[PDB]
Amino acid sequence: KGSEQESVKEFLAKAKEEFLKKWESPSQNTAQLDHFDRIKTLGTGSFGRVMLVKHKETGNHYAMKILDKQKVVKLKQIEHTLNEKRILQAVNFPFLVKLEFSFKDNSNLYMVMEYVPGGEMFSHLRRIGRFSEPHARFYAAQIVLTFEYLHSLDLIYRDLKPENLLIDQQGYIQVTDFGFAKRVKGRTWTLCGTPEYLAPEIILSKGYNKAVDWWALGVLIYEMAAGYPPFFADQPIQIYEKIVSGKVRFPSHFSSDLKDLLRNLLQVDLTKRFGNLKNGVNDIKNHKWFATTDWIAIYQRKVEAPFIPKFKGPGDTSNFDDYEEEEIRVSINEKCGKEFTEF
Amino acid sequence: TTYADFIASGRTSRRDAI
Ligand SMILES: O=S(=O)(c1cccc2cnccc12)N1CCCN(Cc2ccccc2B(O)O)CC1
Predict the structure, then answer these.
(1) CATH for A8-25+120-310, options being 1.10.490.10, 1.10.10.10, 1.10.510.10, 2.30.30.110
(2) Buried b / exposed e along A165-194 (16+ C-beta atoms within 10 A)
(3) Which ligand 1 atom sits nearest the alpha carbon of residue A43?
(4) Is position A321 annotated as part of the catalytic site?
């Protein structure tokens, strides 16, 4: 196993070198709108939409995230949007969505990612109710490796939740969103994230570091295994009080190993939280709840998945909602050119 | 049950950042 972890260290050193190369010289304008056939709208957001499209020459299906530059600026999301694209075009890991193309025009920013028809973990989790612990652990293991990877690049993730995780056709996870991801060596202070997933030190407006991602992993494992998150209420303010309280109630069916893992991840004191101790991520990888987990095998996608969303065709949209279909507006005049020069 | 309380909280749908 000790040879396995010298291997892990050499891998991360190689990945940091490769990431910094693409990080320091990002790809730009690697396709254009006319290259795709629009099929259907898969989601809407305050400053854009996601569309299922098909590459004309290739025939491959893609999720195309289209952001209105004017609204990005209005809602003060410039830094987040430039970061999402710069990060995605530079990272390379099995459980991250794959950015294939990006480009911009007078009005919009476009990011084009391989289409995952299974959709979001969120809807499967809510329909099924909860996942069994082996099922939950298979997903968790992939987030653990993914955070090891991102953290080795000094990237804090800050956006973990079932909404931002896809289940692909082999039943493995793809992490979707990087708008809140930031390269940070020590602490940062932006109040961002989702109420249910916020670590106590975020809520308390003290600086915080990568330990907030290990907190969020605890929330995610809990929500997956229980069917509801550990801290919920009618209003966000009531959630925050529960989070900082230091108390969590576990369902009666949670194993003793799972409870002990979660107490160490949902540790309100970040200096005592697993993932942030001397041994770092190994305290998690070496915890008894993960004794049966073949980390090498997970990375290699060799473990058989406990759930494969029904294969209904590579352009199926059944796992996404229906939205009113609207034109993609492109002005005859360039908008916000300076804000998005690096895109 | 706690799940019933959850399916009563109004926070069972996709959760926005904030
Ligand atoms: O539509 S997604 O599931 C998605 C994202 C990335 C790759 C994908 C590959 N195949 C299929 C879907 C894919 N996904 C992408 C959209 C981001 N939101 C909602 C959303 C919708 C519109 C604009 C922004 C946002 B937002 O978050 O802040 C939810 C997750």
Answers:
(1) 1.10.510.10
(2) bbbbeebbbbbbbbbbbbebeeebeeebbb
(3) 21
(4) no
